[PDB]
Symmetry: D2
Subunit: 32 residues, 4 copies
Amino acid sequence: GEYFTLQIRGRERFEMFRELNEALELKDAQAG
Amino acid sequence: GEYFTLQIRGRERFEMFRELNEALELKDAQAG
Amino acid sequence: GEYFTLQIRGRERFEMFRELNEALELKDAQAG
Amino acid sequence: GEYFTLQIRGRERFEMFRELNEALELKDAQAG
């Protein structure tokens, strides 16, 4: 639904969360 | 180090990532 | 590559990690 | 409560999940 932003400290941590978020979005995309 | 922002879709997902991020920050805080 | 097991406490936390792991695996599956 | 195990593929992914799980457990430990 709505969008939220999360501030993250550190490039490695950011990359980790970005990867996780993209994977969840790819998974969601499979049903619509 | 530097801060990054990540846009997340959905309140439940946002809450999940927020929880994870806070936990990592609490863990980091234990050595400084 | 190799497989590792992680013991998790709590059904809700387990479900969260399972979801994340499945999403990453779905993402990986897209290139092979 | 109860414990569950999750099979994970890849050492780097395993380490990432282990880190996340330990952080959540550290966070929980702060209220009991």
